[PDB]
From Swiss-Prot:
Protein name: MBT domain-containing protein 1
Any GO MF annotation of the entry: histone H4K20me2 reader activity
Free-text function comment from the UniProt entry: Chromatin reader component of the NuA4 histone acetyltransferase complex, a multiprotein complex involved in transcriptional activation of select genes principally by acetylation of nucleosomal histones H4 and H2A. The NuA4 complex plays a direct role in repair of DNA double-strand breaks (DSBs) by promoting homologous recombination (HR). MBTD1 specifically recognizes and binds monomethylated and dimethylated 'Lys-20' on histone H4 (H4K20me1 and H4K20me2, respectively).
Result of changing residue 92 to D: Impaired interaction with EPC1
Amino acid sequence: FSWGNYINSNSFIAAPVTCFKHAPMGTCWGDISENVRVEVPNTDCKVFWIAGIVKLAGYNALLRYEGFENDSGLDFWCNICGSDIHPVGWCAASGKPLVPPRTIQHKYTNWKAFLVKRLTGAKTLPPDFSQKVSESMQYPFKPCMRVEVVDKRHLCRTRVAVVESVIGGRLRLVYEESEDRTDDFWCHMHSPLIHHIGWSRSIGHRFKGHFDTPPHLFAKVKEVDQSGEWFKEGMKLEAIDPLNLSTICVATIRKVLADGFLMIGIDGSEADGSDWFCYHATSPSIFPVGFCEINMIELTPPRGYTKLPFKWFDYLRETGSIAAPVKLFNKDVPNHGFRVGMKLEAVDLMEPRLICVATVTRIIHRLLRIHFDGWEEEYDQWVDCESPDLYPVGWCQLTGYQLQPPA
């Protein structure tokens, strides 16, 4: 399985790296494009020649050695953030030889002349590109750093986890009181699920050579004024079910915490309080009553609720409750860049260990429907467009993470 062949067999389109602000180089890609030329090794000949970008898919570039024109006989895919890609001028700056592919060595006669003619004015890689690449992959979370994280088996409490590995900004955490042999939690270092040691007590969230994580390293949460009209216990809303990212569910505000966090319960599936999960009020995972109907999204009603189809108006009268007002959910919709059909590499939020060949299949504003290629649609997930659990084609190869293929 190659992303290159997959994308070529089917003329697929990859989300540009630019859609993923949290990924390596997600902020430094603005001048990468088709017909950028680079210096890369000449495999047809230890030495280098010029290649132009025929096709760009996430981090992956389809390159054609200069002098080939429309002949794709030796086009080859590679990772533009990989270690043998250099800007035009790198050989000359290092005193290295530019040597033509054996295949077109006789196609043109005057090579120096030919390179002045082709490269004069050429777009190439930003300067400092290779330093920026290399800074990109230097993550601030280290092994042995302790964090607070949601308890997989008891969502309403945090427990303490320790970073055992970093791969590509993703952390494999291990619970400090492990309850089985292989007792990890995989998440991005910008996950909204991890917090400084002392977070739970500070905010009123329940809780069950290592050192505390420097509090400054955590993703910043948007500041909210919760002192006028706010959420209040018993208000209804819709919420992506944390145990089932395929579904948006009928839900209720169960606790209003400090700093804007909310304990939310899925009606029909609530124990004691142990199933409450914590979303920030600005979370893209909760929506007002009506969101689903107005947008043609399957709303999942409470377990055991028989009067179908579900009607909110009836459920409000029955449970004697009100909708959280729509204004409480206002938030920007970034111009995220994603388009239906777009390929990318996604985390399977039901088994986060796995990162998978995937496609965006619906966009409702900032909300994406993510499909895992080759698998059942039933298991498509709802994910925000700024999720830190989405990545560009090539990210696995770049960081050394194992990629699951389709099907």
